[PDB]
Amino acid sequence: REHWATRLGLILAMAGYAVDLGNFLRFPVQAAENGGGAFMIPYIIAFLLVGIPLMWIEWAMGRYGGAQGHGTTPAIFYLLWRNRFAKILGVFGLWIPLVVAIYYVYIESWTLGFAIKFLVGLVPEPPTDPDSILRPFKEFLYSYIGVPKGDEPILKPSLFAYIVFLITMFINVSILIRGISKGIERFAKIAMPTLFILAVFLVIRVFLLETPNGTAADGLNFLWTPDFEKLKDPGVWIAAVGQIFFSLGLGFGAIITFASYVRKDQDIVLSGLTAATLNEKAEVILGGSISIPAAVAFFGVANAVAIAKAGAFNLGFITLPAIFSQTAGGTFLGFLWFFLLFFAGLTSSIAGMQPMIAFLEDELKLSRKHAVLWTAAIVFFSAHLVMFLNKSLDEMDFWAGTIGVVFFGLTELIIFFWIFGADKAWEEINRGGIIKVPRIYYYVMRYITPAFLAVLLVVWAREYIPKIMEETHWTVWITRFYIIGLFLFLTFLVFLAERRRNHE
Ligand SMILES: CCCCCCCCO[C@@H]1O[C@H](CO)[C@@H](O)[C@H](O)[C@H]1O
Ligand SMILES: CCCCCCCCO[C@@H]1O[C@H](CO)[C@@H](O)[C@H](O)[C@H]1O
Ligand SMILES: CN(C)C[C@@H](c1ccc(O)cc1)C1(O)CCCCC1
Ligand SMILES: CN(C)C[C@@H](c1ccc(O)cc1)C1(O)CCCCC1
Ligand code: NA
Ligand code: NA
Numbered sequence: 001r002e003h004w005a006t007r008l009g010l011i012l013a014m015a016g017y018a019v020d021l022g023n024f025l026r027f028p029v030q031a032a033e034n035g036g037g038a039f040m041i042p043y044i045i046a047f048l049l050v051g052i053p054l055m056w057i058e059w060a061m062g063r064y065g066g067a068q069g070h071g072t073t074p075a076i077f078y079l080l081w082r083n084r085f086a087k088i089l090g091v092f093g094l095w096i097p098l099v100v101a102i103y104y105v106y107i108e109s110w111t112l113g114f115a116i117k118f119l120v121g122l123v124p125e126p127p128t129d130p131d132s133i134l135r136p137f138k139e140f141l142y143s144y145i146g147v148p149k150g151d152e153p154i155l156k157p158s159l160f161a162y163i164v165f166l167i168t169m170f171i172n173v174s175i176l177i178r179g180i181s182k183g184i185e186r187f188a189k190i191a192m193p194t195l196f197i198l199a200v201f202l203v204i205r206v207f208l209l210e211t212p213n214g215t216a217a218d219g220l221n222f223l224w225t226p227d228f229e230k231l232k233d234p235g236v237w238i239a240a241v242g243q244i245f246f247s248l249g250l251g252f253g254a255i256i257t258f259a260s261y262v263r264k265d266q267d268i269v270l271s272g273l274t275a276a277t278l279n280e281k282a283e284v285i286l287g288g289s290i291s292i293p294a295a296v297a298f299f300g301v302a303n304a305v306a307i308a309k310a311g312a313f314n315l316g317f318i319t320l321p322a323i324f325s326q327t328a329g330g331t332f333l334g335f336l337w338f339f340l341l342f343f344a345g346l347t348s349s350i351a352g353m354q355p356m357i358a359f360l361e362d363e364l365k366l367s368r369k370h371a372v373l374w375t376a377a378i379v380f381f382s383a384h385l386v387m388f389l390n391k392s393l394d395e396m397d398f399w400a401g402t403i404g405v406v407f408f409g410l411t412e413l414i415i416f417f418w419i420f421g422a423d424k425a426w427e428e429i430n431r432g433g434i435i436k437v438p439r440i441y442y443y444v445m446r447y448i449t450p451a452f453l454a455v456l457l458v459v460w461a462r463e464y465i466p467k468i469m470e471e472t473h474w475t476v477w478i479t480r481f482y483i484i485g486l487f488l489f490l491t492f493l494v495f496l497a498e499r500r501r502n503h504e
Contacts (some may be wrong), residue, residue, distance in 0.1 A: 001069060003261050009185035011275050012192045014258060016248050018346030019195065019311035021107070024287040025312035028223065030243045030290060032308040034236040037226035042240035047280065051244040054409060054444045056437060057416055058250060060429040062259025071260035071358035073253050074494045081422040087494055089415070091368040092408045093253030094355055094486050099400035100252065100354040103393045108345035109168035110317070113144065113161055116340035121331055123321070130299055137322040145378050153372075153390040153475045155421040164417055165387070169380050175350050176357060177372045180261050184350055191343045198340040199286040205333060206258055206294045213300035219293025222304045246387040248276060248281055249348075251409030257355040265384065269433035291315050298323045314359055316341065338345075353379060357428070365498035385482060397481040398468060403460065410453040422446050 001387045005009040025094070031039045048252045065076035073093025077086040117123055125134035141147075146156030157165075175183045230236050249255065262268060295315065305320065320337060326328030353375055360371035386393045417425045430436050468476075 001066060001264055004185055005181040006300060007271060009189055011271055013184050013188040014275035015278035016188045016192055017254055017284045017351035018247065019342045020348040021282060021341055022247055023283040024291060025316045027283050028292040029308050029312045030239055032223055032484050034239050035227040035230035037224040038228045038231055039240065041231065042237045046241040046244040049444055049448050050241055051248050051302050051363060051450045053441055054250045054270050055248055056429050057412060059259040059272045060293060061416055063262045063268055064258040064428050066260030066262060067264040070362050071257045072258060072355050075363060075414055080415050089411055091487060091490050091494060092404065093357055094490050096400045096404045097252050097254050097355045099396050099483050099486060100381045101349060103396050104352060105168060105349050106383050106386050107167055108349050109165040111338045111341040112166040112168055112318060113344055113376040115335055115342055116337060118331055118334035125325060127427040128370060134318060136321050137318045141317050148390050153473060155388050155390050169376060172350055173372060173376050177369060179368055179499060188347060191347050195343050198336055202336060203286060203289045206290050209294060209297040211298050216293040216297045218301045219296035222296055222301050223288060223292045230264050238456060238459055241452055247279060251405035253355050254351045255359050258351060265376045267432050267434045269430060269437055270435050274430065291320060295319055295325055389475060392479045396483060403412045406457045407451055410450060410457060413450045417445055
């Protein structure tokens with residue numbers, strides 16, 4: 001079996017998986033809307049009671065499976081619980097990251113496209129008033145994506161956007177086809193320092209921003225001034241638990257697959273804790289110092305609330321580029337921003353396609369070349385739905401990227417810590433550990449952590465599902481039909497895998 005060459009490479013590859021666009025775009029928006037500085041209270045608590053425990057568990061499940069030559073949940077769940085229902089549940093740990101990758105690589109291609117356009121100066125150049133500056137950039141993004149101008153739910157991506165997507169798929173393949181150590185690990189050792197350097201430069205350059213409407217200090221002020229009155233709202237606590245779960249990328253099955261390349265008696269306790277801490281530092285220190293302070297420095301603290309409510313996608317692809325065009329060398333500054341987002345996305349997408357690759361290698365005995373190429377073919381083909389059907393991305397992101405991940409994360413807990421055995425699971429986590437997991441975490445993993453996820457799943461299901469099922473355009477069924485078919489296809493592959501094993 002393939003293995004990570006160094007401990008540093010493993011940690012950077014794991015942190016690289018976690019650190020993405022959400023760190024620099026989603027977190028700052030969530031924090032500003034939920035108490036600002038006071039949001040750090042439930043954020044840390046969620047990190048201690050949910051994020052950290054579940055991550056140790058996914059590392060453990062991965063390493064345990066890897067020792068027996070299996071990197072994906074259909075096989076791994078069966079090893080933890082020899083039941084037919086376990087293999088089926090395990091399909092979700094293959095289905096979720098595949099479906100997400102189908103839309104994420106496209107989003108990733110946007111950042112490369114924008115990076116190129118900004119580097120060469122092929123960007124709008126306004127003109128005054130905020131709407132007069134934002135609108136040319138709004139249209140810039142809309143023309144790139146091909147946002148519907150009529151009543152049809154049809155996207156029409158520019159030829160440039162399509163070609164960049166092809167290039168982006170090529171780059172993902174180039175890294176993945178070289179394997180774990182010479183590909184993913186090797187890239188992580190280059191991408192993470194580059195990511196850190198670009199982020200620091202952007203933080204510094206943002207801090208120097210001075211406009212008649214305000215400064216960057218006003219931005220850090222608005223964002224970090226505690227509003228403890230919001231701590232009463234359970235939605236804030238739900239948002240904190242949600243943000244922690246999303247940022248660490250739990251319940252995607254990607255962590256499990258990566259951990260399956262960790263040697264049997266190699267540490268996962270400290271390595272896991274370190275990777276998680278890196279994502280958090282990158283999230284609160286770097287992510288919280290760029291987008292929001294810049295938006296406040298330029299538009300004034302008077303528009304800070306409106307900016308936060310506008311969303312993370314508006315902030316990263318419209319608002320920030322618009323502000324850049326109004327600063328000295330902002331064209332190059334825009335390049336660095338999207339270059340940053342691209343590498344952050346690329347380190348995440350190579351991780352997200354690895355489970356499907358690992359399934360074909362471990363269970364269907366495909367060579368790495370064939371496994372990578374076929375995985376890329378599935379992703380590339382399926383991505384045309386996201387590229388041409390409006391809101392297809394939103395539907396996939398809800399079922400797989402939102403509801404699915406919390407459900408699967410809870411499924412991981414129950415199978416590992418309740419079915420497989422809490423004592424066996426506890427030993428499996430701490431085995432080979434440089435440091436040992438504090439004894440208190442045994443009860444957290446067994447009672448507290450699943451309780452939090454259960455609440456999160458129930459609340460979101462009652463809140464969002466009726467809306468999605470009743471107030472959406474009929475075209476969502478196109479996306480639903482296709483991704484359900486993808487599940488059936490993966491279920492069939494699991495069936496072929498067990499029939500091949502019975503023969504050999
Ligand atoms: C779900 C993926 C399907 C999207 C494929 C859309 C391809 C768009 O192709 C369309 O072909 C037509 C000719 O038949 C042309 O008239 C249109 O201009 C062209 O855009
Ligand atoms: C998810 C599906 C995305 C829809 C793809 C949009 C393509 C719309 O394109 C349509 O293609 C038809 C070709 O059969 C032509 O008859 C129409 O003239 C053309 O507008
Ligand atoms: C779970 N949600 C809702 C967040 C995702 C998203 C997807 C679609 C969308 O319209 C907004 C956010 C997101 O993860 C996709 C791009 C990276 C930042 C946000
Ligand atoms: C840890 N994060 C945030 C990255 C993940 C992700 C998940 C959802 C999403 O909307 C964006 C990225 C991702 O790595 C999951 C597997 C498929 C590629 C993206
Ligand atoms: Na993250
Ligand atoms: Na990443």
